[PDB]
Write a protein that binds this ligand. Structure first.
Ligand code: NA
Length: 129
């Protein structure tokens, strides 16, 4: 599924991401834009052999099991394929654990490089939330 901007904002809010660990909804939508372009099926291989999965490009190195990331953990206790679903429940649940890990949204390098400090509210601008 390719979400619309305001459609993803509504989904994330419903699943309790807005202001989770003090991160406004615009932060989550901005991170999704530059991680996945709002595409739930997005997969990208890392140089280390791990893979990033879904709207928030959750990494098989720590968070999900894809069976091909040697020496890796599955701290969200899910198959990485669960993170490609049209339903973002699993991605949100797991993203809650990632952002709680101590470095906040800095865990998403594209959040740090492209969203952090910017006018993130623009991302929910004109959305009926
Ligand atoms: Na893993």
């Amino acid at each position: 599924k390719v979400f619309g901007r305001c459609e993803l904002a509504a989904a994330m809010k419903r699943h309790g991401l807005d202001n989770y660990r003090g991160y406004s909804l615009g932060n989550w939508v901005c991170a999704a834009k530059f991680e996945s372009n709002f595409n739930t099926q997005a997969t990208n291989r890392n140089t280390d052999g791990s893979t990033d999965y879904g709207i928030l490009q959750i990494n098989s190195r720590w968070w999900c099991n894809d069976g091909r990331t040697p020496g890796s953990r599955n701290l969200c206790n899910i198959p990485c394929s669960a993170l490609l679903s049209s339903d973002i429940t699993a991605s949100v649940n797991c993203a809650k654990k990632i952002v709680s890990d101590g470095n906040g949204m800095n865990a998403w390098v594209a959040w740090r490089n492209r969203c952090k400090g910017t006018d993130v509210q623009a991302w929910i601008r004109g959305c009926r939330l």
